Amino acid sequence: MEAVVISGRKLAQQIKQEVRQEVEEWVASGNKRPHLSVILVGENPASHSYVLNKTRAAAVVGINSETIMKPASISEEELLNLINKLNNDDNVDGLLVQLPLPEHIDERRICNAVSPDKDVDGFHVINVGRMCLDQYSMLPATPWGVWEIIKRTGIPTLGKNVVVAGRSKNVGMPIAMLLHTDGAHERPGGDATVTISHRYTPKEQLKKHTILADIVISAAGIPNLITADMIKEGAAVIDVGINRVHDTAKPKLVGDVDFEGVRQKAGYITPVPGGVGPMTVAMLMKNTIIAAKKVL
Amino acid sequence: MEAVVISGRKLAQQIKQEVRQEVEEWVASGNKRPHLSVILVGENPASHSYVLNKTRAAAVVGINSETIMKPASISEEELLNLINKLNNDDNVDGLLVQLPLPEHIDERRICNAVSPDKDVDGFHVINVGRMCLDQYSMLPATPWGVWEIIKRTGIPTLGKNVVVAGRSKNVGMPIAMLLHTDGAHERPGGDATVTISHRYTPKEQLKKHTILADIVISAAGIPNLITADMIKEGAAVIDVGINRVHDPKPKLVGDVDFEGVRQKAGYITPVPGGVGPMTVAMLMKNTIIAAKKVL
Ligand SMILES: NC(=O)c1ccc[n+]([C@@H]2O[C@H](COP(=O)([O-])OP(=O)(O)OC[C@H]3O[C@@H](n4cnc5c(N)ncnc54)[C@H](O)[C@@H]3O)[C@@H](O)[C@H]2O)c1
Ligand SMILES: NC(=O)c1ccc[n+]([C@@H]2O[C@H](COP(=O)([O-])OP(=O)(O)OC[C@H]3O[C@@H](n4cnc5c(N)ncnc54)[C@H](O)[C@@H]3O)[C@@H](O)[C@H]2O)c1
Ligand SMILES: NC1=NC(=O)C(NC(=O)Nc2ccc(C(=O)N[C@@H](CCc3nnn[nH]3)C(=O)O)nc2)C(N)=N1
Ligand SMILES: NC1=NC(=O)[C@@H](NC(=O)Nc2ccc(C(=O)N[C@@H](CCc3nnn[nH]3)C(=O)O)nc2)C(N)=N1
């Protein structure tokens, strides 16, 4: 028993090639080349890196892009004015605001200002609602990337035990929603039995649910939250965390999972970096071509 | 140990008393008396009784009501024009369409046709999204009733293990949403550790999670789903089911083996008289919220 390491990087690169073919055919049919606009506020270094990866991926798949960078001191009204400009620009197919934003800007007001037709993050209240009702919607990139990892790997979900650690509205909540819901609904779900945990779940209780799990998805942002004692043998372990830590001098990226210990016990495991992160970027490229195609 | 049998009838009475004081103050300050309209389609006997309980409760808390009964042969179009007229009648503060609807009518189109400011059921896609984002919203009556039973009985949720059986969009899902979410958010949650189960959860796996639970909430519509062996001693067991069965004559039971589980649990809700009356009571609360226009 040693875990298969699922390369999120490799799977993402493949999906990007699928999107490239689709974009290139869309353009060859006489359509406007798709354009993604990303708004970046302030100087969070994680945000700058993730956004650079989004724009590199857009170039790879033939989508035009711009990153618009504003100071953290921008007002909410100034950001709204920019959004309304880009909502009215017929060259822009996809529009997203990188999170998190400064405290003085209301994130949900910003997310709801993006025209739902251009809402490639799936964060507008109508996309959130439709998703929670298992209707067709623009799915958020990270949750859909987690789903794609599980399904493209052929890891089964129907009747299975799943634990999600984390309940954030952009990651943990939608993963739990996708995994537990009906396969027969308009937007199929995974028909798993899902346990959601969070900052007030006691360690010992997390463990008692993880030990029954066929799939553990950690989305908490806590190094070594998940260790091999907490995992049953042959389980799939998906690490959504991206934690900036220091070593052994260097700054470095680790996940929520003790990768070395857990790879001895799990059947499957994703690494950090190169796991869920690149899949987030690929699923965004998928949403952008879907948005440009005005099919939803 | 013998479980405390929580009385849904008594808790509902306290909530309705609160709504009557709030309504009477509101009107005494010179405001329009609240008005609830209910649309009832067809002849489902449960739907009729439930709507009659809602309009009786409205009258005793000072809320005006009308029930508009339409035949099952109604078209989706005819239903939509009735909703539109009610959305544009400024006397109407609250509007709901009793479910289930006939098979030729798309329930989702109907729920989204009610104006969100009159959507006392909380079933419009905007209320569902807001709720799932922990924002201020009209909470659905049955899920909010489950919350109030737990909170007013003083059963703790923060850090506790909860299992919900059922994943329906109007009942099981919102209950799981209220119970797991953050106590500090705009619309507070219970901060519990929540497992959701459904028709593809094997019985064995259900038991392995319920056996760990401090609170088991059953919303599946299946007699004797929850039996004493499935429950941790001292646990709260909340029974949302309302099933019609046969007795040594016709009878109503929940999802819980009441006689059995009552010995094991620390708290249990009966059926009838548990969650049902709370469903009615929380609708009265949403109706006064709608009339005040605070959202
Ligand atoms: N593509 C990717 O791989 C990707 C994308 C975005 C964010 N992230 C990473 O994922 C994490 C989650 O995303 P977010 O930005 O929504 O986070 P967030 O800051 O909103 O909070 C994450 C969650 O962690 C939970 N938590 C804290 N302690 C816990 C414990 N002991 N057990 C279980 N849960 C606990 C909190 O209750 C909260 O829901 C981040 O911290 C970041 O490291 C990864
Ligand atoms: N105030 C109240 O007490 C109130 C309000 C509404 C409905 N109800 C009752 O609840 C019943 C069902 O309501 P609903 O909205 O859940 O209807 P529904 O049929 O849409 O949902 C039933 C749910 O039960 C699940 N289920 C089926 N078998 C299961 C199993 N073995 N284990 C776990 N879950 C299982 C299904 O996956 C589904 O999500 C109704 O028949 C009604 O009697 C009560
Ligand atoms: N739009 C909409 N919104 C909803 O909210 C809906 N749900 C709903 O109305 N539920 C509900 C409302 C009331 C009662 C109730 O009074 N229960 C009593 C009597 C039991 C009884 N059985 N037969 N006669 N009486 C008890 O349990 O004690 N129970 C359930 C729905 N179906 N549609
Ligand atoms: N509006 C909005 N939408 C979103 O989707 C959001 N989430 C998001 O962008 N997530 C994300 C995007 C990209 C990557 C990524 O490229 N990961 C690499 C490591 C890269 C790296 N290099 N140095 N530090 N990190 C890896 O994991 O291998 N990781 C996460 C969000 N915050 N806001």
Author numbering:
A (entry chain A): 35 to 281, 284 to 332
B (entry chain B): 35 to 282, 286 to 332
Question: What's the publication's text?
Answer:
The folate metabolism enzyme MTHFD2 (methylenetetrahydrofolate dehydrogenase/cyclohydrolase) is consistently overexpressed in cancer but its roles are not fully characterized, and current candidate inhibitors have limited potency for clinical development. Indeed, the one-carbon metabolism enzyme MTHFD2 stands out as the most consistently overexpressed metabolic enzyme across human tumors. MTHFD2 enzymatic function supports rapid cell proliferation during early embryogenesis, after which it is replaced by the mitochondrial protein MTHFD2L in healthy mature tissue.
The tool compound TH7299, as well as two of the most promising candidates, TH9028 and TH9619, were chosen to investigate the MTHFD2 mechanism of action and cancer biology. Furthermore, we determined the cocrystal structures of TH7299, TH9028 and TH9619 in complexes with human MTHFD2 to assess their binding mode and identify critical interactions in the binding pocket. At a predetermined temperature of 57 °C, isothermal dose–response fingerprint (CETSAITDRF) analysis of TH7299, TH9028 and TH9619 in HL-60 cells accurately reflected their relative potencies in biochemical and viability assays, as well as demonstrating the difference in target stabilization potential for TH9619 in nontumorigenic lymphoblastoid cell line (LCL)-889 cells compared with HL-60 AML cells. In contrast, TH9028 and TH9619 showed overall strong antiproliferative efficacy in AML cells and T-ALL Jurkat cells comparable to standard-of-care compounds, with reduced effect on LCL viability. Treatment with TH7299 resulted in approximately 50% reduction of RF speed and significantly shorter DNA fibers; meanwhile supplementation with thymidine was sufficient to fully rescue replication speeds. Similar fork speed reductions were also observed on TH9028 treatment in HL-60 and THP-1 cells. Although MTX and VE-821 significantly blocked DNA RF progression in both cancer and nontumorigenic cells, MTHFD2 inhibitors effectively impaired DNA replication only in AML cells, sparing nontumorigenic lymphocytes. The same cancer selectivity was observed for TH9028.
